[PDB]
Design a binder for this molecule. Structure first.
Ligand SMILES: CC(=O)N[C@H]1[C@H](O[C@H]2[C@@H](O)[C@@H](CO)O[C@@H](O[C@H]3[C@H](O)[C@@H](O)[C@H](O)O[C@@H]3CO)[C@@H]2O)O[C@H](CO)[C@@H](O[C@@H]2O[C@H](CO)[C@H](O)[C@H](O)[C@H]2O)[C@@H]1O
Length: 164
């Protein structure tokens, strides 16, 4: 299991815990989403370089929502949004600034989503966790992806930093 396991085609399912799902989206827009329809709704929006700030109305888990996006740099920005009730609107949360079309997600046994936040450029690239349990919720990976055991996290980080 030294070889990078994948790629697998886009899919929605109750993904197993303790794996990093390393997505490699070719386009932009909504690349990841999950909800338990009760306490957590989350998605990630991929924004291309040189994107003037604007509002877009997009499909998130078959609901249309209006969000502000921007990318004033020359690299990719993966931006997370979440909310914790059906009546709330989404809030922009963490983001990954990266020269690679790569982000990764892990759901731990407590049901929490982790992914990569910050950037190599600013020296704060880190695994962050949303302490918002959603065990057994359907995860949408809207991208080709690879599967890395989370005992091999440093290998995932190396891909996030340097590409495939
Ligand atoms: C865990 C996490 O998401 N950390 C983020 C940090 O999140 C904080 C932010 O969402 C604020 C918004 O008000 O809420 C914080 O939680 C508070 C609860 O909402 C509140 O009810 C409770 O009483 O107190 C909690 C603690 O204050 C939440 O933790 O937000 C910062 C700023 O955006 C993030 O850091 C930024 O991360 C990006 C990459 O994603 C870059 O690295 C930026 O340089 C960095 O500032 C932090 O990761």
């Amino acid at each position: 299991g030294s070889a990078l396991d994948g790629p697998y085609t886009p899919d929605s399912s109750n993904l197993p815990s303790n794996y990093w799902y390393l997505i490699n989206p070719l386009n932009d827009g909504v690349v990841f989403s999950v909800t338990n329809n009760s306490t957590f709704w989350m998605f990630t929006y991929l924004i291309l370089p040189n994107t003037a700030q604007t509002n877009v109305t997009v499909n998130v888990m078959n609901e249309t929502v209006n969000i502000s996006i921007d990318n004033s740099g020359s690299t990719y920005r993966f931006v997370d949004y979440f909310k914790t009730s059906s009546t709330q609107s989404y809030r922009q949360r963490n983001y990954l600034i990266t020269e690679h079309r790569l982000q990764a997600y892990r759901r731990d046994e407590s049901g929490n989503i982790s992914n990569y936040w910050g950037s190599s450029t600013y020296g704060d690239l880190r695994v962050g966790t949303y302490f918002n349990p959603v065990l057994n919720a359907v995860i949408n990976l809207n991208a080709d992806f690879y599967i890395i055991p989370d005992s091999q996290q440093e290998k995932c980080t190396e891909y996030i930093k340097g590409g495939l």
